[PDB]
UniProtKB/Swiss-Prot annotation, chain B:
Name the record gives this protein: Spike glycoprotein
Disulfide bonds: 99-134, 232-242, 277-302, 320-373, 332-466, 421-429, 479-531, 558-575, 588-597, 657-679, 662-668, 930-941, 980-1024
InterPro entries per UniProt: bCoV_S1_N, BETA_CORONA_SPIKE, CoV_S1_C, S2_sf_CoV, Spike_N_sf, Spike_S1_N_SARS-CoV-like, Spike_S1_RBD_bCoV, Spike_S1_RBD_SARS-CoV-2
Top-level division of the source organism's lineage: Viruses
Ranges of residues in domain BetaCoV S1-NTD: 1-244
Effect of residue 316 to F: In strain: Omicron/BA.1, Omicron/BA.2, Omicron/BA.2.12.1, Omicron/BA.2.75, Omicron/BA.4, Omicron/BA.5, Omicron/BQ.1.1, Omicron/XBB.1.5, Omicron/EG.5.1
From Swiss-Prot, chain D:
Subunit structure: Binds to host ACE2. RBD also interacts with the N-linked glycan on 'Asn-90' of ACE2. Cleavage of S generates a polybasic C-terminal sequence on S1 that binds to host Neuropilin-1 (NRP1) and Neuropilin-2 (NRP2) receptors. Interacts with host integrin alpha-5/beta-1 (ITGA5:ITGB1) and with ACE2 in complex with integrin alpha-5/beta-1 (ITGA5:ITGB1). May interact via cytoplasmic c-terminus with M protein. May interact (via N-terminus) with host bilirubin and biliverdin, thereby preventing antibody binding to the SARS-CoV-2 spike NTD via an allosteric mechanism.
Organism superkingdom: Viruses
Glycan-carrying positions: 43
Role noted for this protein: Attaches the virion to the cell membrane by interacting with host receptor, initiating the infection. The major receptor is host ACE2. When S2/S2' has been cleaved, binding to the receptor triggers direct fusion at the cell membrane. When S2/S2' has not been cleaved, binding to the receptor results in internalization of the virus by endocytosis using host TFRC and GRM2 and leading to fusion of the virion membrane with the host endosomal membrane. Alternatively, may use NRP1/NRP2 and integrin as entry receptors.
Name used for this protein in its record: Spike protein S1
Length: 177, 1038, 50, 50, 50
């Protein structure tokens, strides 16, 4: 149990490091801008809506309700520890990374959050798969329209379907069992 | 008579083992420092006879004044039964003799005041009376004076002494010094000590401490001598030092222990009082039974506290066998028969398993293995009735002895001999019934002892006819276990908010755990919540900073010792102590739980030493226009040497299964080969490990098909890297930073310790360095081509100019600022040598990996000390102890446990190796994709982008000194997605049209080098009729 | 415990993959085609999950 | 003087002191190492090596 | 590895047949229960290993 305590501390270090380079790569704990002027990129279901005092969004609630059967998540040897980054501020990270790629684009990781506009950030995005950003400048309003529809269909596959929930359910359920 | 303090003094030596500049924490009898002590008085007329117990030992120290104190009586109790250690002291010497002590009042000696010339001090001398057992009789060897100090420990009579000979410069109390106390002699004696009594030489009739199973972390010296000592829990920084085994600890939370709290233990509860148990009408009955006609009636489905009938005050006899009658209610039984009948008064003795009499002969037999209690009760003033109580008869004739609890009622024509009766009795035809005949004036022998038999019939049938054990007041809101008829659990037992049904008696959760319980005595309901649990990891900085700790509790409801000598700021992680809250949330330093980081701080204004915590916020939110307009692009950059480190391999510990286990033991090998295969599969799997990371070492280092020597012509042009190129002037062909790293990394240390068969690396130091040299030479001077087949030389002035464009940067900025680039490159190298000389944080994880390697080997070896029902590390002693047949039958399971221990160890070895292969293919990824080239994919080769990395030697590891382009300015200004000129948009595929407002220029996505709009860079494509926030601009042709 | 450690190994390998997704796939665009989901990959929006 | 045994950093037998004389000794496991046989393919002859 | 999985049945720990059922039949059903207890613990060892 000395070595296994070491191993579980290793588990803790690996998991919160996973958190770190997955979430806490940000050099500045960060929050969403007040206004929302994007060009049809409705983010209510994803971005933390300032309407709810908690900084989560519609799909966060959909996720939670879909996997409420977390079983343990506590009583007997079930010495679960809360995340080293709490759910509310891990959502704050979600927002941070969100707005980071929205504003400081891909340059975000290189240091300071050198913000750029999201709509023209997609220009580098199209140019990132070999298609010139002219298509952005030529159809991007519609691009946003079917993008929003795609997110709505994602929500549909979240609520009336479990396809988007599959291997999350599998991993949490296998941890549980 | 005030008390005093102790600082650190009183450290002994464990045993004769010799160590060398190591840090051990072997556990034995220890002295708590900072523990309460006492300062006595010296003659200047109090007796001064401090006589305390020897509990777990005694800590002692003194300064002699006139050779006054010599008398000690170390014993158990001194009832003229236990020994005593007589002591003598000349000038600077010791001697011990042990035997008896028999004196009253005040034993002591005396030195007279007004002695004319001299004296001898042996007149009173209450020292010896009959020295009749003196086995360990071992004899050998004007301001303030020196100091003495004696400590001991009780180990099977080893009253081992420890002494020191050096003066001190404190006259009031204990010195402000620290030292060990080396052992002098360990007498074996053989009679223990628990009480120590002392006497001394005073005309008319000296610190005392105590020991406990404390803990320590020693730190010896290159001379193999004790230097200091620290406990663990006395101040939680000491706990950190204990769990990390170092006196210079970096700041961090280190898991200390859990706390298995249990306030007011637990409550035992059974249902409400019995129902349908009218014992009175069966035991105080008017209607009893005859002895041969003993009645038989059951009691069932109602409980019986066998003590209430005991205190019901209605019997004269209480005999119960087998199980304890007192508080027998806590035991639950199948069923009980409660029968009442009448026999002779003298026969209480005869009512027991195995006893005899006419009752057993013809009337009533009792089982030899009776399972029940037996009671007789007196009503001597009611045992007879007018007309005589002869109603109940007894048997005088019976041919057969009764079977256990067999009842004979048959009253047929009795036959004794072979001459019959024809239904009519007479001579040789014996009447089988006679009556009791109770008269008011009868003697005590016939004066009834009316007995009642309680038999507990515990067959295989269920046990629910039981006793009310301890049904008491419900314990609300106190974390306790419970005993509801057989179920337990730490419950928050209060009124619970749920609906309940008749089928409901016990409940589980989805995880099958007790979450709700129900009151069995009445219609009440309860819930359970895990009350406290939680471990402790102390948030304190290291010995470099203060010793004022902060302690955290993990998810446990503030119900254990609030802030006091033993502030509080509650958090989601639990009850936080030893650290006052701070409103501001600084940049984190050490996460503790629920995202709180605590840094020790001093609020200078009096001087308080307390740690302060806060929540997770690297500064605050950055306020820039994030909707549509602001664009930020750095007009300046930096090149930080992101010194990330990757473990390229691992010690090729090709263990030899048998020789690891069976050294100088053919019996062990013989028994192992019965299990056989296993350790062999372990062995070649480990060899597969070895070849796996050696292939990793090859393809990361000998990826070139050729050995190459660094050119001795260092014309790199003002950019040099001499600290990383092996300078041809050293015995080990590794450069400066390898020297610094290898000096920093230490500790297994050699290939010649034990069954720890360290294989030499497939690449030894000089030639792994040769590969590193080859790699750096190539990637600096020929590059990808010498890493991808045929060599083609390339100057570094172009080796990195290519890879700005390989990232997105342009080699023009290199040509424009490369002299500086080099200067800050050397600055980065200086940062390397500085922050890696003694600062281990940046060089952490390679040393860390060789650590879990080291303590993996360490748990491998001390797993032998984990004797699995054995009495030694290795059974070699046990191997010789028993006959090779008996050796077979013991070494079977013993060394079976040993081989499963091997399997466990090699399993963590496999898993470690697995993550090592992950990291090793990662190292290949780095080297090949990023040094023989460049990972155009963003920010994978260390923080920021990547240009170069320089393979530098590291035991089973490497550092990749990334040259990363890192922005330095925030030109966070207005934007233009494209250039709507006449319905069309001007834009390069890369780049953004940017301006502070003066001139809209195109500039690269990671460097602010704005440029004129030109038809070459900016080429028309598509249109701009669908945009979100565009502004117009003109276009020109250069 | 060994099963949990092994599962930790696989999940943490997936987690380094997750960090790589964060980098080449959120903090950047994977020029390496078609691993960030079916089809190509432009970018992605991270979001919490237990 | 009080010492008689020895140890090392890895907490294994390194040095011992003679109970009959004072001498600063060392102990090292005999040879161990290994036996890895080098040889060409057995399609080539039996010129052996250890 | 498959051949291993097969051949630790030869690694019979104190029994003398591949499949333990005949060892079970070789001892009295209580005594066979006792011996099969630790044959099956060893077999679980083999399972968890493989
Ligand atoms: C265990 O206890 C016995 C008790 O007798 C010791 O025996 C004596 O040991 C001492 C020293 O240990 C011996 O002195 C010897 O001195 C020799 C030098 O010779 C010169 O000095 C002598 C002094 O009288 C002159 O007479 C002579 O002419 C020379 O001028 C050394 O050469 C001896 O060394 C031998 O013994 C030691 C161990 O003592 C070994 O290590 C050496 O290899 C060598 O064999 C020695 O030092 C004395 O002579 C002994 N006398 C007897 C009667 O035994 C043992 O020595 C002690 N064990 C140990 C290990 O010391
Ligand atoms: C660990 O054990 C080692 C083994 O002995 C110790 O080595 C000893 O070190 C001391 C000094 O460090 C040497 O002492 C010698 O003393 C003579 C004469 O002493 C005069 O000078 C000293 C000042 O040094 C003065 O205080 C005295 O009063 C004398 O006037 C000097 O001339 C020498 O140069 C040397 O200092 C021992 O000889 C040496 N032992 C040997 C070589 O066997 C070591 O000190 C121990 N570790 C520690 C930390 O003490
Ligand atoms: C981007 O997405 C959000 C997602 O909620 C969108 O919110 C939408 O807001 C409009 C008005 O602001 C809602 O229109 C409705 O119109 C009827 C007409 O009578 C009115 O009665 C309603 O009260 C409401 O105003 C619309 O329902 C709502 N959509 C959803 C899904 O909630 C909105 O398009 C965007 N939000 C931004 C840019 O802040
Ligand atoms: C077994 O346990 C107790 C023993 O009587 C019972 O609870 C106690 O009795 C009733 C409820 O049954 C509570 O009300 C009291 O009733 C008495 C008798 O009428 C009345 O004189 C009092 O003024 C009071 O109203 C009583 O408070 C309660 N005891 C306590 C301490 O609260 C319980 O019901 C019994 N259950 C069974 C199944 O026998
Ligand atoms: C470029 O970025 C920096 C910070 O990254 C910007 O500085 C920040 O500017 C915002 C508003 O532009 C400031 O918010 C407001 O500041 C005023 C006075 O400082 C205050 O009275 C308001 O209550 C509000 O907080 C913010 O403080 C300031 N500093 C930060 C965020 O650290 C800068 O404005 C950006 N450049 C341009 C041209 O916008
Ligand atoms: C040690 O010596 C004692 C002798 O002292 C006796 O005990 C004293 C308390 C006191 O009563 C003296 O007068 C006694 O002479 C041994 O004690 C006796 O030993 C014998 C056998 O050797 C035994 O039968 C007696 O019961 C012991 N006690 C007494 C009171 O006589 C004792 O055995 C010796 N050994 C040890 C280990 O204590
Ligand atoms: C000094 O210590 C030793 C024991 O450690 C003892 O010395 C004895 O002293 C007396 C008186 O001079 C002598 O007759 C004895 O011969 C000495 N002992 C031996 C073994 O030689 C004594 O305890 C201390 N000295 C004094 C005077 O008390
Ligand atoms: C060791 O110390 C004990 C502590 O009192 C002495 O007392 C006896 O200890 C034994 C076993 O440890 C018990 O069985 C007895 O009941 C104890 N007797 C009493 C009166 O407590 C014990 O005598 C000491 N050892 C020796 C050899 O004397
Ligand atoms: C980019 O920033 C660096 C420093 O980070 C600048 O280097 C300094 O330049 C000035 C003048 O150009 C010199 O006086 C300093 O000695 C330089 N070194 C320092 C300050 O350490 C560099 O000049 C900047 N880039 C440009 C194009 O000016
Ligand atoms: C190449 O780098 C080396 C670094 O080792 C520089 O060598 C230093 O030279 C100065 C003066 O000759 C010495 O005082 C130092 O001791 C040398 N070593 C150091 C600083 O580590 C050398 O100057 C560099 N060459 C060029 C052209 O810049
Ligand atoms: C330690 O000494 C102080 C002096 O006042 C005293 O108050 C305290 O009770 C002592 N503690 C114990 C229990 O030894
Ligand atoms: C602890 O539990 C009790 C149960 O009544 C509750 O009242 C209290 O608020 C809890 N405190 C915390 C914060 O754990
Ligand atoms: C704590 O800090 C917040 C930060 O906005 C501030 O609003 C609040 O007034 C502060 N309160 C105290 C007591 O310092
Ligand atoms: C604003 O624009 C001018 C261009 O004339 C530029 O020199 C200046 O640096 C810009 N402001 C800042 C803060 O960079
Ligand atoms: C950006 O949005 C703000 C508010 O919606 C508006 O005032 C501004 O003109 C917009 N700029 C562009 C370029 O769309
Ligand atoms: C053995 O086979 C190898 C395989 O290429 C070949 O090179 C070698 O010449 C052969 N030698 C003999 C003696 O068959």
């Amino acid at each position: 149990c000395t070595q296994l305590n070491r191993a579980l501390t290793g588990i803790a270090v690996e998991q919160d490091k996973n958190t770190q380079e997955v979430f806490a790569q940000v050099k500045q704990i960060y929050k969403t801008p007040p206004i929302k002027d994007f060009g049809g990129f409705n983010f209510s279901q994803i971005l933390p809506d300032p309407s709810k005092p908690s900084k989560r969004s519609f799909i966060e609630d959909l996720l939670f309700n879909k996997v409420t059967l977390a079983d343990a998540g506590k009583f007997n040897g079930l010495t679960v520890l809360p995340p080293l980054l709490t759910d509310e501020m891990i959502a704050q990270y979600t927002s941070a990374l969100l707005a980071g790629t929205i504003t400081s684009g891909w340059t975000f990781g290189a240091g300071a959050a050198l913000q750029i506009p999201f709509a023209m950030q997609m220009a580098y995005r199209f140019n990132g798969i070999g298609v010139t950003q002219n298509v952005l400048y030529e159809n991007q309003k519609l691009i946003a329209n079917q993008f929003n529809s795609a997110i709505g269909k994602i929500q549909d596959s979240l609520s009336s379907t479990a396809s988007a929930l599959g291997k999350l359910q599998d991993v949490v359920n296998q941890n549980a069992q | 008579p005030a008390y005093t303090n102790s600082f650190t003094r009183g450290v002994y030596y464990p045993d004769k083992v010799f160590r060398s500049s190591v840090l051990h924490s072997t556990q034995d009898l220890f002295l708590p420092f900072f523990s309460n002590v006492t300062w006595f008085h010296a003659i200047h007329k109090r007796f001064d006879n401090p006589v305390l117990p020897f509990n777990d030992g005694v800590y002692f120290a003194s300064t002699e004044k006139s050779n006054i104190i010599r008398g000690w009586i170390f014993g158990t109790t001194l009832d003229s039964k236990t020994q005593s250690l007589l002591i003598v002291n000349n000038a600077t010497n010791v001697v011990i003799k042990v035997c008896e002590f028999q004196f009253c009042n005040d034993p002591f000696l005396g030195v007279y005041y007004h002695k004319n010339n001299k004296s001898w001090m042996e007149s009173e001398f209450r020292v010896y009376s009959s020295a009749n057992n003196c086995t360990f009789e071992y004899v050998s060897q004007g301001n303030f004076k020196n100091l003495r100090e004696f400590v001991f420990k009780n180990i099977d009579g080893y009253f081992k002494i420890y002494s020191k000979h050096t003066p001190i410069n404190l006259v009031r109390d204990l010195p402000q010094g620290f030292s060990a106390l080396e052992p002098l002699v360990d007498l074996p004696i053989g009679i223990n000590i628990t009480r120590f009594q002392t006497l001394l030489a005073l005309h008319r009739s000296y610190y005392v401490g105590y020991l406990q199973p404390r803990t320590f972390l020693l730190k010896y010296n290159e001379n193999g001598t004790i230097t200091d000592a620290v406990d663990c829990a006395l101040d939680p920084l000491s706990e950190t030092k204990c769990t990390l085994k170092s006196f210079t600890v970096e700041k961090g939370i280190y898991q200390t222990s859990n706390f298995r709290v249990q306030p007011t233990e637990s409550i035992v509860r059974f249902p409400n009082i019995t129902n349908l148990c009218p014992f009175g009408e069966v035991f105080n009955a008017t209607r009893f039974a005859s002895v041969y006609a003993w009645n038989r009636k059951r009691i069932s489905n109602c409980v019986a506290d066998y003590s209430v009938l005991y205190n019901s005050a209605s019997f004269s006899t209480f005999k119960c066998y087998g199980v304890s009658p007192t508080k027998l209610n806590d035991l639950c039984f199948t069923n009980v028969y409660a029968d009442s009948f009448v026999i002779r008064g003298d026969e209480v003795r005869q009512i027991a398993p195995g006893q005899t009499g006419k009752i057993a002969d013809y009337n009533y037999k009792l089982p030899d293995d009776f399972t029940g209690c037996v009671i007789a009760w007196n009503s001597n003033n009611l045992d007879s009735k007018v007309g005589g109580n002869y109603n109940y008869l007894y048997r005088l004739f019976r041919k057969s002895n009764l079977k256990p609890f067999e009842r004979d009622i048959s009253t047929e024509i009795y036959q004794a001999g072979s001459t019959p009766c024809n239904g009519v009795e007479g001579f040789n035809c014996y009447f089988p019934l006679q009556s009791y005949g109770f008269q008011p004036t009868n003697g005590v022998g016939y004066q009834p002892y009316r007995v009642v038999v309680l038999s507990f019939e515990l067959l295989h049938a269920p046990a629910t006819v039981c006793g009310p054990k301890k049904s008491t007041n419900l314990v609300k809101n106190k974390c306790v276990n419970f005993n509801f008829n057989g179920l337990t659990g730490t419950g928050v037992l209060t009124e619970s908010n749920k609906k309940f049904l008749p089928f409901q008696q016990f409940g589980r959760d989805i995880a099958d755990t007790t979450d709700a319980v129900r009151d069995p005595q009445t219609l009440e309901i309860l819930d359970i919540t895990p009350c406290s649990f939680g471990g402790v990891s102390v948030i304190t900085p290291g010995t470099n900073t203060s010793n004022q700790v902060a302690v955290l509790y993990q998810g446990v409801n503030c119900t254990e010792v609030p802030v006091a000598i033993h502030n509080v700021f509650q958090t989601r992680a639990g009850c936080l102590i030893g650290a006052e809250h701070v409103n501001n949330s600084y940049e984190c330093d050490i996460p503790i739980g629920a995202g709180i980081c605590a840094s020790y701080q001093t609020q200078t204004n009096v001087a308080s030493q307390s740690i302060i915590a806060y929540t997770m916020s690297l500064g605050a939110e950055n306020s820039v226009a994030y909707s549509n307009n602001s664009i930020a692009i750095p007009t300046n950059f930096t090149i930080s040497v992101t010194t990330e480190i990757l473990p390229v391999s691992m010690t090729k510990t090709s263990v030899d299964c048998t020789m690891y286990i069976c050294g100088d033991s053919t019996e062990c090998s013989n028994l192992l080969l019965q299990y056989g295969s296993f350790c062999t599969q372990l062995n070649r799997a480990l060899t597969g490990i070895a070849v796996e990371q050696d292939k990793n070492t090859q393809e990361v280092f000998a990826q070139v098909k050729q050995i190459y020597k660094t050119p001795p012509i260092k014309d790199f042009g003002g950019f040099n890297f001499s600290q990383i190129l092996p300078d041809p002037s050293k015995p080990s062909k590794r450069s400066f930073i390898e020297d610094l790293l290898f000096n920093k990394v230490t500790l297994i240390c050699a290939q010649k310790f034990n069954g720890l068969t360290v294989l030499p690396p497939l690449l030894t130091d000089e030639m792994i360095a040769q590969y590193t040299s080859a790699l750096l030479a190539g990637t600096i001077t020929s590059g990808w081509t010498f890493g991808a087949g045929a060599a083609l030389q390339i100057p570094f002035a172009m080796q990195m100019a290519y890879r700005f464009n390989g990232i997105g940067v342009t080699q023009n900025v290199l040509y424009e600022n490369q002299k500086l680039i080099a200067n800050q490159f050397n600055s980065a190298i200086g940062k390397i040598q500085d922050s890696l000389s003694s600062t281990a944080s940046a060089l952490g994880k390679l040393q860390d990996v060789v650590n879990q390697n080291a303590q993996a080997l360490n748990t491998l070896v001390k797993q032998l000390s984990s004797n699995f029902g054995a009495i030694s590390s290795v059974l070699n002693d046990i191997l010789s102890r028993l006959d090779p047949p008996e050796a077979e039958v013991q070494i079977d399971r013993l060394i079976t446990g040993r081989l499963q221990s091997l399997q466990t160890y090699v399993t963590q070895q496999l898993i470690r190796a697995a993550e090592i292969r992950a990291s090793a293919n990662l190292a290949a990824t780095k080297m090949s994709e990023c040094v023989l080239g460049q990972s155009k994919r963003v920010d994978f080769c260390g923080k920021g982008y990547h240009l170069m990395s320089f393979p530098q030697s590291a035991p089973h590891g490497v550092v990749f000194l990334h040259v990363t382009y890192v922005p330095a300015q925030e030109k966070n200004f207005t934007t233009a997605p494209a250039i709507c000129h006449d319905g069309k948009a001007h834009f390069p595929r890369e780049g953004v049209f940017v301006s502070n407002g003066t001139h809209w220029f195109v500039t690269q996505r990671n460097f602010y080098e704005p440029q004129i709009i030109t038809t070459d860079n900016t080429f028309v494509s598509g249109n701009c009729d669908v945009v979100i926030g565009i502004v117009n601009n003109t276009v020109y042709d250069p």
